[PDB]
Amino acid sequence: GVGSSSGNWHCDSTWLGDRVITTSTRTWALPTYNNHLYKQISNGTATNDNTYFGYSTPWGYFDFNRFHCHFSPRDWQRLINNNWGFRPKRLSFKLFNIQVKEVTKTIANNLTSTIQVFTDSEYQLPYVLGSAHQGCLPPFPADVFMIPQYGYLTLNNGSQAVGRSSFYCLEYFPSQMLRTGNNFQFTYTFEDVPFHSSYAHSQSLDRLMNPLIDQYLYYLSRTQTNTQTLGFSQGGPNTMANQAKNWLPGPCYRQQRVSTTTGQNNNSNFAWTAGTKYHLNGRNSLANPGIAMATHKDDEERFFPSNGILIFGKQNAARDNADYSDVMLTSEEEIKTTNPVATEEYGIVADNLQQQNTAPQIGTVNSQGALPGMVWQNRDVYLQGPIWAKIPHTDGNFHPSPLMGGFGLKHPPPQILIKNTPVPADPPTTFNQSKLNSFITQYSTGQVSVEIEWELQKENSKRWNPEIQYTSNYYKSTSVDFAVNTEGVYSEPRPIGTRYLTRNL
Amino acid sequence: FHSSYAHSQSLDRLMNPLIDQYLYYLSRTQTNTQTLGFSQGGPNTMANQAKNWLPGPCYRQQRVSTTTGQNNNSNFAWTAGTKYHLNGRNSLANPGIAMAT
Amino acid sequence: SPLMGGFGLKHPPPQILIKNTPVPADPPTTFNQSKLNSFITQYSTGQVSVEIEWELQKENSKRWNPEIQYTSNYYKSTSVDFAVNTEGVYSEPRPIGTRYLTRNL
């Protein structure tokens, strides 16, 4: 009905046992995108690394692939201070209280206008969620947000398409059409995904041994008396670097080190030239943030990999060339215990065969793929960070955990595509075969509810001393952190990670 | 199942080409003096965007042109061949791991 | 017991919060991540009903002489007390307390 609400506001979080159910409602506004048209979009030689061919669609899409879309900062604190892990279990999504409005400036209700909503439940469309794009549900529930426009990329050769390039018409899908009295809803069940490691290791991989007992294994301790010899010693509490060990640190893809103290950096523009990159079809792309590696070693917080960390912008940070004070650098220092430092070499290997005439030579391993016995931690998730990514449908993957963090899903939450149904203006009174291009200017607004049930891994720890916990600062300040200022602007002052509790290795 | 299909998307082009990323990347280190400038990955800086996946493993092979005049004038099929070493024996990594030709 | 008088309640009548749901004006046709600040100017009106059931303590008094009672003044006046004036303005001319009957200590 026109005069009856099609749904209620549901923003809440219920903690019950090993589950937390976050539900969040937001008010959205969907404009008409592209003037109801599908437009081919391209970029040519811009450098070759940035070329693309794709399509802009008249459809919007709903994104809730950030943790702050579901967790309030206090709820995030509850989660990270008390749980060793968490994972999504199921979600329910609702569209309701839809209002389609005609603008001629006067804005009027168009009671008979529709919106079209469908979920790509078969994953037949290019999945553009999981690319850390803007347009997600705002962290602050009172915030009204604009629905982002759906577009996708296909195969390109410069600015040109190839024969394998795919064009998708989203109208070629079954869509529910909704008038102002209608509502849309669907439920989704997450696949069995591993718990995110919401903990930092309280032991280092090279310090898993008893510090009081010698090893019964020997290591080559000396090769020279001086003349050649072979001396063997037992690894013990003092020669702990020489001890036989069962495991290796995770893989390494070395990144350039950048200091937040700019005077310590090289006086050159090396963000791209020295950037750590991968090469794909003659195109260079940053390995950003790349594989999960420790941001820095001990007492080197000022250092970060050049493109090896998630960088969030503070409120009102510039899109381009934001200063360091306008951005929020994350740090994966919690995984120092298992993952190699992002800006350091993995290790040292022999580069030759030493003889009595040739001294042994060593090679510095700046990139190390998977080795047996290697263990590693994934990148941390953040309150502002992504939740899930679609695992690409390929023959093979290795540890398909998304590199910007979160849960890798073969069948992620489906894309929810929404569009204002075009309403033609008055057509001519004589028939014209040409497609109509005169449309009533129109936009829709409504409420969107997303409810996610998360399973929790409770910490079962015998640690005696108190743990590190995320806490708000006790000292006075002009404004409350994670609140609005005097102008009503909600801001997130820092990126809250997830690893505060500790586990043994 | 054998993948009897080719991907119509590239791994570095899985993002929405209309929306900026909320993540920032180090875009400049020099103003000139040292500085730290950060930009949001977008439709134009698509090579700089944060991405979730990496291309498959690589074991680089020497490039040979079917236009023989473009090849080096030497017999390098074996000497420049991409090989693995096993028990002091060299064998070609033939055809080796699946990489784009 | 509340100092300005009345009933002290651990769980008082809950606050009833009401808000007009924001209705955005027409958004731009190109995506902008910024929160919308252009809204349709809007207000709501309606009726509110509150029904309270009160329990009474009846006076059970053996006092012989008449009690003090709250009464309106009998003498003539320009306007009726606790009524509207010629301009339609309702006014309460005095604060009416509650303690008129008597009890022994």
XYZ file of C-alpha atoms in Angstrom, chain A residues 49-52 56 61 66 126-127 130-134 149 151 153-155 164 166 262 265 267-272 278 280 283-286 288 311 313 317-322 386 389-390 392-393 395 402-404, chain B residues 1-3 5-30 32-55:
106
model
C 49.187 -0.371 -17.121
C 45.936 1.596 -16.736
C 44.122 0.644 -19.945
C 40.690 -0.923 -19.721
C 28.928 1.459 -17.538
C 24.260 -1.919 -6.554
C 32.913 -3.251 5.083
C 31.182 -9.667 -13.180
C 31.624 -9.497 -9.416
C 35.510 -7.107 -3.045
C 37.506 -4.392 -4.802
C 37.409 -2.053 -1.772
C 35.188 0.423 -3.600
C 33.330 3.345 -2.109
C 26.719 2.848 -10.119
C 30.044 -1.049 -14.006
C 35.475 -4.524 -17.024
C 36.077 -7.208 -19.596
C 39.083 -8.196 -21.694
C 36.471 -12.735 -25.889
C 31.801 -10.092 -22.675
C 60.059 11.896 5.238
C 63.340 8.694 2.640
C 64.688 12.326 -2.320
C 62.949 10.897 -5.370
C 59.466 9.974 -6.559
C 59.665 6.196 -6.214
C 56.113 5.236 -5.214
C 55.560 3.623 -8.621
C 53.214 -8.101 -10.511
C 50.106 -9.714 -16.086
C 50.532 -4.816 -17.707
C 52.199 -3.818 -14.449
C 50.022 -3.613 -11.352
C 51.081 -2.910 -7.788
C 48.940 -3.841 -3.232
C 45.720 2.850 4.033
C 41.625 8.044 4.690
C 40.784 13.369 3.180
C 41.534 14.409 -0.386
C 41.002 11.848 -3.123
C 44.398 12.632 -4.681
C 47.672 13.459 -2.918
C 46.317 13.382 0.614
C 36.539 -5.213 3.616
C 36.092 -11.193 -1.555
C 34.981 -13.573 -4.263
C 38.135 -16.098 -8.686
C 36.804 -19.159 -10.482
C 41.631 -24.162 -11.841
C 41.853 -12.129 -0.008
C 44.992 -10.033 0.127
C 43.340 -6.866 1.433
C 36.510 -30.546 -14.250
C 38.966 -29.361 -16.853
C 38.494 -25.635 -17.428
C 36.727 -21.932 -20.921
C 38.764 -18.764 -21.114
C 38.236 -15.961 -18.635
C 36.450 -12.910 -20.022
C 37.952 -10.810 -17.223
C 41.554 -10.140 -16.305
C 42.776 -10.604 -12.748
C 43.920 -6.973 -12.553
C 40.584 -5.735 -13.952
C 38.074 -7.214 -11.502
C 37.072 -3.836 -10.067
C 34.221 -1.472 -10.827
C 35.580 1.026 -13.397
C 33.268 3.815 -12.180
C 33.890 3.942 -8.421
C 36.988 4.986 -6.529
C 38.452 2.791 -3.839
C 38.188 3.880 -0.238
C 41.714 2.533 0.250
C 44.678 4.812 -0.360
C 48.022 4.044 -1.948
C 51.306 5.899 -1.675
C 51.094 8.047 -4.802
C 54.084 10.367 -4.381
C 57.240 10.460 -2.285
C 58.551 13.810 -3.572
C 61.734 19.183 -4.639
C 61.838 17.585 -1.195
C 60.649 14.356 0.370
C 56.953 14.033 1.160
C 54.231 11.406 1.509
C 51.278 11.856 -0.835
C 48.446 9.340 -0.820
C 45.748 8.924 -3.448
C 42.673 6.755 -3.768
C 42.795 4.127 -6.480
C 40.216 4.892 -9.125
C 39.200 4.289 -12.728
C 42.323 6.023 -14.042
C 44.923 4.719 -11.563
C 43.797 1.152 -12.052
C 47.320 -0.263 -11.804
C 47.636 1.275 -8.321
C 44.367 -0.078 -6.922
C 44.383 -2.433 -3.974
C 43.635 -5.950 -5.183
C 42.796 -9.246 -3.525
C 44.593 -11.698 -5.804
C 47.901 -12.350 -7.524
C 48.668 -14.019 -10.861
